[PDB]
Design a protein around this ligand. Structure first.
Ligand SMILES: Nc1ncnc2c1ncn2[C@@H]1O[C@H](COP(=O)(O)OP(=O)(O)NP(=O)(O)O)[C@@H](O)[C@H]1O
Ligand SMILES: Nc1ncnc2c1ncn2[C@@H]1O[C@H](COP(=O)(O)OP(=O)(O)NP(=O)(O)O)[C@@H](O)[C@H]1O
Ligand SMILES: Nc1ncnc2c1ncn2[C@@H]1O[C@H](COP(=O)(O)OP(=O)(O)NP(=O)(O)O)[C@@H](O)[C@H]1O
Ligand SMILES: Nc1ncnc2c1ncn2[C@@H]1O[C@H](COP(=O)(O)OP(=O)(O)NP(=O)(O)O)[C@@H](O)[C@H]1O
Ligand SMILES: [Zn+2]
Ligand SMILES: [Zn+2]
Ligand SMILES: [Zn+2]
Ligand SMILES: [Zn+2]
Ligand SMILES: [Zn+2]
Ligand SMILES: [Zn+2]
Lengths: 703, 703
DNA sequence: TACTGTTACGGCTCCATCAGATGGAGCCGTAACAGTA
DNA sequence: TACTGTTACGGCTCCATCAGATGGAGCCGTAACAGTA
């Protein structure tokens, strides 16, 4: 009936004991960095998978990507668990829609088994010892599934090495097929593998459902066609029927990629299994979230238990049990602050999330909107990607929001066209802009700063000090001391990523890692330098009473007071304090940062640049993996930036960020190739007065 | 609440629909070959594992040993499943107790991580780049887990190639360590890996629980020592504390190996998982079975569902739901004959198992036992393995049974000493006997025939015709026809395992197998010869109106009438008919035979030999994987053999076979090194009069 | 003249894609040889 | 003289044991260069 966890002390959890009911919709809320992912994904999922993969093959456990055993006492009432984590990276030039969903492997098998080969020179059928066409004197090699893939030299096109593009233009030889001519002659139903991939998902499902095959080949392909049709049906049902299997995964949007990842791991139809979803609503519109909620309720109805760590209001309003962590974040949180039904969380004074839900704390909506001051910049002939020749004028000096469902072209319109043109005109960047006619009004701005929506990169060689750039100033200050000057030290001596002034027992890592072979690797503290990352010679040089280790092991609040007379350092630390990271250390490794904290570090990297008084701030979904309090702080700083006399445009699905905006531009009216038209454009009240778009309906519902 | 299976047509199932309750003890009874394994292991376990391993890593699914998708419509209420199958082979000279339970991998990791190397020439500690002792000028190689294993050239002893024995004697170099001298110098707590392996399990558990390690090494070994202790505790609790991790798996008994396999896959402590056990009581005494029943009830109490296909009366008397298949076997069965509680099966007239349980059918107990006729053969100084110098006289001309718990030395006493000495004296075999003084009374016998307890070998090149040896006579008869004589045909032309007279499109297999890569292979019928295994020239030669394909595609009952004037063929087919295989074809492949049918084929191979009127019949657990009806038939034929004037000794844990015996010899009083003494020796009533042995208690309880 | 932005180069880390090899035992078929009746 | 048992040799099949490699993107540190105030 219950999952009992006792003595959970993983990461920042303060030895908490929590009972999670089974066969229920249980959400884990709280601030960013409070211990939701560490409670669910790092502990419960890890134990549930570890206790089941041991009752399987011994050799195959190594390739499963095993998880380290959590620092817990005992877990009762556990069950096998499948989880979809909150960490997405993507951006691979060798991964497509076919390989991500694994349908391409099935297609390779199907073409290798029951395909019909030919000679690519005359088209006559090839028959056999040697599998060659006797007319053109060409010897085709053996037919195997590894010859229909572009990630090995056997089946990859020689010119582009299976990349597709070789000035970025399609490959002259394969024309984007990525496979050699020999492997493109095997046809099923009149099409080779590339042509079948180029077909839309909806078209391909019916192409495979209407295939005429001999009695011999149907026996072989019965176990392949059924799986292919099941996967295509999952993709269609999730709401992505307009995609093609040949699209690169480096071009998919956030919502499309998230839905692709969701549809793969959900359709198994099991029973008595715990499903763990970590932030399942990133880059998803309100209608996409409602569809996902319906699907998840259907999945629970089979007899499963759901543990979803969600920040959105809609998810918490459709659940039977809420577990709230906190009361703060980082080292200041990690306890079970409140529990129970959403009404109990609303009535619980100690729960910050309940305070926001109840209305005790809220994001202030301005009484009067900021009307445009007569300055507009206009774009005409927007035809990039799936934009159907629309023209929109973006105001200046006000807070602008760009809305619309996933695939409507919000990124393609704002990011590509606007940012690339502005950066080429003002920052003198060497970037190819999108397909458009012209932009009028560039002479009304001075600089452009953008925040992309891709997640940041993780590495043990980077911390907030290096990412924000303040570490360079700190190292210069340390190298400017009299003792460092008389010892010959430079700024490169004080960095743990440069050899010469770092602990050589760990190469500046600070902790040695012992390599197991079939078990997760272990991390143990260093012994030579005690984990200070530096030798004794470096640590002797002190500035204002602290050496570099002591200045790298101090929180942001402490470094704010420590660095007061230095303008650049104070400005950067003040921005870091403003975005919300007033409790994390100045040298915590990136790999140990939560998603929200990494996102806030990325925001503070760009929000700390000097403003010229008339600048362009382009933000692509800034409120991803952020609690309502972080959203409130971000809205406050953005509104202060606007009041300073600057123009800010924000592409957000968050309703609270939208409801405070000054001018809303809506793209739609549907996702994919069916959208690209400006549904509405005006003040939030005017857009709420329009019933053609779901965004207007939600805006008028909340107002 | 229920597992609903509809349209199950795998193997010989006749499209049955069955609902199996969840969180219950459900047994699947029926005859041998009726469709229990095909219903449970091949369908439910296959679907349950297939529907879960897809929600895991893609690469690691290949190494998991995937199961083919069953020929079923839809299964509802499924859940992830772990199963222990009924097919055990063992007999590997490169597998020990350590590797089977995987504790040896953990020990290799532990020794590679926190070991203490030395030089094997002087004993001084080795320190370093190269790990070498500067005194003896010896350079020890790198320390890795792959250097502590004898299955790779890095860590295997050169002399014996890691076999241990190089006239079978221990290796002169390693003295049975199987590892080279360099890898035997790494010691933990004063012992190398071989010494720790040689320690008993109970001793080693306390050796690891009382190890003094530095604070540095405890951090590394915390995740290893806990797992090692857990596995050792499982082995101790199952009832096998006397074993040592260095014992070869080719010497373990049936009960010990079965308990080792049971203890590994049960201790996971999950919930909402279906456990499938296929014949879990092979080679296990009554007390071992009672312990296993207690453990299984404890495992179900956690909230699991158990599907155990069992023939034993004890298992069916401790269950809440019985599913009975039949009503016959082979092509004559496959339907759900009866279902419900054990009382309902007792009162169900159509259930053969219920008929046997109720007492309508029973094994007749003779009114008066056959007293010995004054002829005895005596063995003195029995000290083989764990026999403590005991002497027993085995009577002649009566049915003798050897009882006792697993490890008591029943096999070591009867099989090794008696069979090897009798075969060396009478059959002129070149076999080394066991350790004993002498045997008096060999001149009272003429021949010895034995039936070992090891399972038979499976291959697609063998069928009952070839295994029983009747196929050679059939081929000779076919080659003796006038047309074959005039065509130059020989007996080697008529065998599908010899090239020249077989379908070259399949090399006599009869079905081509298409090789997938990450999916289970598919089997499709041949096209050139239509699966007749022979070409047109061979099939033209006909004997008595049938060619060789028609005589290879006929059941045993039909071939009994077809071959009536040939003495040898009729005798062999009559024996095959008597043992119970009157419905299977004469050419069904071995890989498709059930366990019980393969066992009966093995029995009929040896029971068909000519008896001299005074012969020795040694049977080692003949009633393994056989229903009560097959047991009744085997008891009948054995009693007829005894009445013919021969002596039969049977080493069986089956109580029905024991209760009909004429003279019982009991070994005990406990398993392992604590046994080897003759607890009781006399008629069944006399043994029942003794309360020192559990066998006597059971005998007096049933009588 | 210093601040701020860009671009290029080398080293380190992480994520996505890819779809088994080897050794020995058991069985079939065939030939050779001995005991027995 | 024929039946029955054992033993040796070559080919085919199955089970147990064993514990990742490669390619490209993102980040850090450093140098060079241009616009601006
Ligand atoms: N390996 C680690 N070592 C030390 N601290 C860690 C580690 N991993 C995470 N933390 C910290 O533990 C706290 C909780 O992190 P985590 O539980 O992953 O975040 P979360 O609550 O899911 N928040 P978010 O992902 O931003 O919504 C944060 O302060 C992290 O910086
Ligand atoms: N290079 C490309 N080639 C073809 N189609 C593309 C390409 N890049 C993007 N698309 C498609 O163009 C449509 C709009 O993409 P994009 O503008 O990035 O989405 P978006 O509106 O920002 N959605 P989201 O970020 O999820 O809220 C989607 O259907 C994309 O799959
Ligand atoms: N692959 C197969 N093709 C055809 N027939 C098969 C196949 N596998 C099994 N059978 C037959 O199907 C019947 C049931 O076999 P199976 O279900 O494995 O046995 P079982 O009921 O568990 N009996 P047993 O193992 O002896 O206790 C038998 O007649 C088998 O010979
Ligand atoms: N070669 C060997 N070296 C050491 N111990 C051995 C060896 N062979 C067997 N044993 C042990 O000797 C004991 C008796 O073995 P064995 O006589 O085969 O058992 P059994 O009584 O027939 N039991 P079971 O067949 O399971 O009913 C067991 O503890 C075996 O592990
Ligand atoms: Zn040609
Ligand atoms: Zn190309
Ligand atoms: Zn160090
Ligand atoms: Zn030495
Ligand atoms: Zn050796
Ligand atoms: Zn054929």
């Amino acid at each position: 009936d219950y999952i009992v966890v006792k003595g959970a002390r993983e990461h920042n959890l303060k030895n908490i004991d929590v009972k999670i009911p089974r066969d229920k919709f249980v959400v884990i809320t709280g601030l960013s960095g409070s211990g939701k992912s560490s409670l669910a994904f790092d502990t419960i999922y890890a134990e549930g998978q570890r206790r089941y993969v041991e009752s399987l093959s011994s050799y195959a456990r190594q390739f499963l990507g095993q998880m380290e055993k959590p620092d817990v006492d005992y877990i009762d009432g556990l069950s096998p668990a499948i989880a979809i984590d909150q960490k997405t990276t993507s951006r691979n030039p060798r991964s497509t829609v076919g390989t991500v969903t694994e349908i391409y492997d099935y297609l390779r098998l199907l073409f290798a088994r029951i395909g019909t080969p030919h000679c690519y020179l005359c088209g006559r059928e090839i028959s056999q010892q040697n599998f060659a066409c006797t007319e053109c004197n060409v010897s085709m090699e053996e037919i195997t599934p590894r010859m229909f893939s572009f990630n090995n030299p056997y089946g990859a096109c020689p010119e582009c090495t299976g990349l597709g593009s070789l000035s970025n233009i399609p490959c002259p030889v394969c024309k984007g097929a990525r496979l050699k001519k020999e492997s493109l002659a095997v046809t099923i139903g009149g099409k080779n593998i590339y042509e079948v991939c180029c077909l839309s998902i909806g078209e391909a499902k019916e192409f495979f459902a209407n295939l005429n095959l001999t009695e011999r080949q149907q026996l072989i392909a019965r176990q392949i066609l059924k799986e292919i049709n099941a996967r295509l049906g999952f993709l269609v049902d999730v709401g992505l029927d307009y995609l093609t299997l040949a699209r690169a995964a480096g071009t998919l949007s956030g919502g499309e990629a998230q839905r692709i990842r969701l549809a793969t791991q959900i359709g198994s139809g099991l029973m008595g299994v715990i499903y763990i979803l970590d932030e399942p609503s990133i880059g998803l519109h309100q209608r996409d979230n409602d569809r996902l909620l319906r699907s998840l309720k259907k999945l629970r109805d089979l007899g499963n238990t759901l543990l979803v760590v969600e920040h959105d209001e809609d998810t918490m309003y459709a659940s039977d049990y809420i577990i709230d962590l906190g009361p703060g974040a980082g080292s200041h949180g990690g306890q079970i602050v409140a529990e129970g039904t959403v009404e109990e969380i609303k009535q619980n004074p100690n729960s910050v999330t309940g305070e926001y839900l109840s209305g005790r704390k809220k994001i202030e909506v301005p009484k009067e909107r900021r009307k445009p001051n007569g300055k507009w910049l206009e774009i005409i002939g927007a035809r990039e990607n799936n934009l159907k020749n629309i023209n929109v004028r973006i105001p200046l000096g006000v807070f602008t929001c760009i809305t619309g469902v996933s695939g409507s072209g919000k990124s393609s319109l704002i990011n590509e066209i606007l940012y690339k043109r502005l950066a080429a005109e003002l920052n003198r960047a060497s970037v190819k802009p999108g397909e458009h006619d012209l932009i009028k009004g560039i002479e009304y701005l001075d600089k452009v700063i953008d925040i992309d929506q891709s997640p940041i990169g993780r590495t043990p060689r980077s911390n907030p000090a290096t990412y924000t750039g303040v570490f360079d100033f700190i190292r210069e200050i340390f190298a400017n001391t009299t003792e460092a000057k008389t010892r010959g030290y430079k700024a490169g001596r004080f960095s743990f990523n440069v050899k010469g002034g770092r602990c050589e027992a760990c190469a500046g890592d600070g902790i040695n890692k012992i390599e197991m072979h079939f078990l997760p690797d272990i991390y143990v503290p260093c012994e030579v330098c005690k984990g200070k990352r530096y030798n004794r010679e470096t640590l002797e040089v002190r500035y204002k009473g602290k050496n570099i280790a002591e200045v790298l092991d101090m929180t942001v609040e402490e470094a704010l007071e420590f660095f007061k007379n230095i303008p650049r350092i104070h400005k950067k630390i003040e921005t870091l304090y403003d975005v919300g990271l007033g409790y994390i250390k100045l040298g915590q490794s990136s790999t140990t940062l939560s998603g929200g904290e990494a996102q806030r570090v990325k925001l503070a990297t760009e929000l700390s640049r000097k403003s010229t008084g008339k600048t362009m701030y382009i933000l692509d979904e800034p409120t991803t993996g952020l609690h309502m309090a972080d959203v409130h702080r971000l809205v406050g700083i953005l509104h202060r930036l606007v009041e300073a006399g600057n123009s800010v445009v924000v592409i957000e699905h968050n309703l609270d960020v939208i409801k405070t905006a000054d001018y809303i531009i809506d793209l739609g009216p549907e996702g994919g190739s069916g959208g690209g038209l400006v549904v509405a454009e005006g003040t939030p009240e005017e857009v709420a007065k329009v019933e053609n778009s779901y965004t207007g309906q939600f805006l008028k519902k909340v107002l």
